[PDB]
Amino acid sequence: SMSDTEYLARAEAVLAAVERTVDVANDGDHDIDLERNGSVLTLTFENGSKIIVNLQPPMKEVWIAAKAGGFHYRFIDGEWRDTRTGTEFFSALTDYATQQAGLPITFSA
Amino acid sequence: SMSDTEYLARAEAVLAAVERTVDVANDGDHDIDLERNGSVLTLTFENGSKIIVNLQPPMKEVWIAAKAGGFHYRFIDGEWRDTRTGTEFFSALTDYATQQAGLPITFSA
Amino acid sequence: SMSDTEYLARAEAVLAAVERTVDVANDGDHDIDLERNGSVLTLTFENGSKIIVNLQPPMKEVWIAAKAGGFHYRFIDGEWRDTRTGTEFFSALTDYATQQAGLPITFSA
Amino acid sequence: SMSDTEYLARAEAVLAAVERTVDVANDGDHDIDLERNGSVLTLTFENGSKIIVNLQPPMKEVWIAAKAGGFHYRFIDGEWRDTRTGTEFFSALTDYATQQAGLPITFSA
Amino acid sequence: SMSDTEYLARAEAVLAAVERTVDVANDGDHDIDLERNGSVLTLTFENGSKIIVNLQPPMKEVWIAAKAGGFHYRFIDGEWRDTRTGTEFFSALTDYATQQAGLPITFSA
Amino acid sequence: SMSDTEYLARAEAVLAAVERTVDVANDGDHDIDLERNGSVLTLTFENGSKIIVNLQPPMKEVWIAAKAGGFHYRFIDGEWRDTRTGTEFFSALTDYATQQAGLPITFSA
Ligand code: NA
Ligand code: NA
Asked: Coiled-coil regions in this chain (chains A, B, C, D, E, F)?
């Protein structure tokens, strides 16, 4: 269809925030491989496991694919919420990334 | 009633973004006449046609009046959407302004 | 549960905006006592009356307690709205604080 | 020259913030006439006195003209500061507007 | 050294804004190939020419490489400015991209 | 003097960001005691050590007091920088907090 730049600005800002937090983690005790390609951010942990954060423009969503599964987030009333459970994006990502890093990594707005 | 400054801040920011993009277009190949008076932004293209972007505070809306018609936008879940079709504001305005300028003008958040 | 940092960032920003406006009022003709403790902002007016603005994280709300009563606000479609009447936050607070100060204090996004 | 949209976005946001605060004041005890024309905001107080807030793009400035005089503000290190005294914009405007309204009006970021 | 997330948030936001504007241009009369890889945004115009916008973290800069040359921008007093001429980022990019597209493309904050 | 609300909005936003990150850390493996009183944020780690982040309005600064010492930050060209070394705020705080928690805590804009 037509690009929705209001959606893209918000969704791209999520990818960027995630990348900055990983950069900080990598300054310290972490070694997470990070790749940003198009609208896809791929994190590869030291144990070889992965988390991908990406855009789904057709539903104006941001998605996570992690060891725990695949989760979809829509921006509703000021924040990104899991379309099934309502769980807020950064809290879920923190949970999944901490599981996979074996060392806390704290994502926060 | 009482002024809703949260609405006004968002709606005024739309008018301002539209004006900046037109200013840039006017630095280049365009000659669009721009007038900002109160909460009304009037664009007059070289062919004499017009687009008006204005506020409708009673419904917390931003409106377009263009050759294509009159469209009303409400801020829902992080963006300005056409109250009838759901089309996002800047994508619609891009379409209408490009029709009337005869040369692409690209509005974007 | 888990801290919702997207909610907290927005709600904390309300407390901060309220405090800045009171600081400005206090530079001039006002003498409002202000206390910020945790997620609770307490305003004590010259006549001894009070307004408290605080967070209610379980419902992702910001609350007012004032002479006029207790009001609850949720962030819906870009702004903080009274969960019962729909009244926008800063307009309501302006009303209540002006009643209690006996001199206009203007809160605005 | 060429329009500086980064400057214009910041400077226009000042005009908009000033207008919202006046709108709130006008909901209450004030009757300030407000006119926004192009990049010029004219406030006319009940006593007939005036304050104008406007843009000066050639120096990327925002200016005040008030009873107290004419003051020029540049954005330096995160805020708008008087080019002669360093006084921050909203604090100065609060001072001047309160003088002219005869009733406190509190401008705040 | 250590990742500067305040710099990265601002610089990444430039890349994202540029990409959104190109997306809009591509909805209309343009066909610009866009690739985002790491902190590098590559635009390939219909005539085969290129513009790259990328990060230079060691000096907290954003760079352009275009037909017109290589330009470096630092964030100073609220905006991205050419380190040699002071020209603001989006105005320069508009100039270079319009040269290379042969059809106006308007970048704006 | 007069309250500088442009400074206060930026400085308060630092305190709020720090608090949100600690809240997230506390959802996981951490137990950091957090107290926000006025413009002072006190963090008490499990080993009894402390970090305080607070405002210094007279110089428009944000300060850290940590085991490593006392550091002062001013907002210059888009970010908070150590007035002696130029080190950016969140990178320094990450370093100090990680030292004192004994488990990485990642602060990021
Ligand atoms: Na919303
Ligand atoms: Na700055």
From this structure: none
